[PDB]
Scaffold this active site. Structure first.
Site, PDB file in Angstrom:
ATOM      1  N   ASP A 183       0.829  -1.220   0.000  1.00 41.20           N
ATOM      2  CA  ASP A 183       0.000   0.000   0.000  1.00 41.20           C
ATOM      3  C   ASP A 183       0.850   1.252   0.000  1.00 41.20           C
ATOM      4  O   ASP A 183       1.264   1.756   1.041  1.00 41.20           O
ATOM      5  CB  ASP A 183      -0.884  -0.056   1.248  1.00 41.20           C
ATOM      6  CG  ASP A 183      -1.956   0.994   1.283  1.00 41.20           C
ATOM      7  OD1 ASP A 183      -1.829   1.924   0.479  1.00 41.20           O
ATOM      8  OD2 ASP A 183      -2.874   0.808   2.120  1.00 41.20           O
ATOM      9  N   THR A 184       1.121   1.809  -1.192  1.00 37.39           N
ATOM     10  CA  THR A 184       1.963   2.989  -1.262  1.00 37.39           C
ATOM     11  C   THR A 184       1.306   4.234  -0.700  1.00 37.39           C
ATOM     12  O   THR A 184       2.050   5.178  -0.424  1.00 37.39           O
ATOM     13  CB  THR A 184       2.419   3.255  -2.706  1.00 37.39           C
ATOM     14  OG1 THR A 184       1.231   3.441  -3.535  1.00 37.39           O
ATOM     15  CG2 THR A 184       3.249   2.149  -3.306  1.00 37.39           C
ATOM     16  N   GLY A 185       0.004   4.224  -0.499  1.00 35.24           N
ATOM     17  CA  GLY A 185      -0.656   5.330   0.172  1.00 35.24           C
ATOM     18  C   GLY A 185      -0.657   5.304   1.679  1.00 35.24           C
ATOM     19  O   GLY A 185      -1.106   6.250   2.328  1.00 35.24           O
TER      20      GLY A 185
END
Ligand code: MK1
Lengths: 99, 99
Positions: A25-27
């Site tokens: 999850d890059t967010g």
């Protein structure tokens, strides 16, 4: 590997010696795992995302294997809807976004 | 381009005739843009984040440029603290995770 995004980027992790499925999850600034027993000391923290804040247990310097790659860092444990591997550990395994 | 994950992976987007900063978010199924007055028809939706659900307006076939790459798809508009580019549009610009 190279992972495309037509499906959720789920991988197998190992934490506390137990296998789990988790989302890359890059967010997510941080890594948050569903409620579990985990060896180590913890401190209470709150984290916020869409929909508001939740209370979690912050564990520091936890060994975690992510898709066969080692990371050792901060793992939050609490009532997250899905297990989330965030940037703090994705940086350790050398993950980048490419397009 | 390649984007490392030491900091939030923010890029410039163009939507509705406006330039904005947005987060490339592999954990997000959908794209959620901060409240803006987009024209035409929409459908009510609720979407779930780590802290619960929020109410958004679902707009279809919205043109959006992401770091210079055109895409067209569904965009959700509502009260988010950050503009989020999710997988539905990241796939369209050929984005991958790599490690
Ligand atoms: C479509 C929508 C965007 C609503 N999706 C999400 O919120 C999904 C939800 N799933 C869950 C889900 C819920 C319902 C249904 N399916 C899946 C878990 C993963 N998130 C994606 C996260 O990447 C979203 C970001 C948004 C954000 C970024 C910065 C600031 C505020 C909000 C997110 O929640 N990030 C936060 C975050 C996350 C984990 C740990 C720490 C932190 C802090 C912060 O970086």
């Amino acid at each position: 590997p190279q992972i495309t995004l037509w499906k959720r980027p789920l991988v197998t992790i190992k934490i506390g010696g137990q296998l789990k499925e988790a989302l890359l999850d890059t967010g997510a600034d941080d890594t948050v795992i569903e409620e579990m027993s985990l060896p180590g000391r913890w401190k209470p923290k709150m984290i916020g995302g869409i929909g508001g804040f939740i209370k979690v247990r912050q564990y520091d310097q936890i060994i975690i294997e992510i898709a066969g790659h080692k990371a050792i860092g901060t793992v939050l444990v609490g009532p997250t809807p899905v297990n989330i591997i965030g940037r703090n550990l994705m940086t350790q395994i050398g993950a980048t976004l490419n397009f």
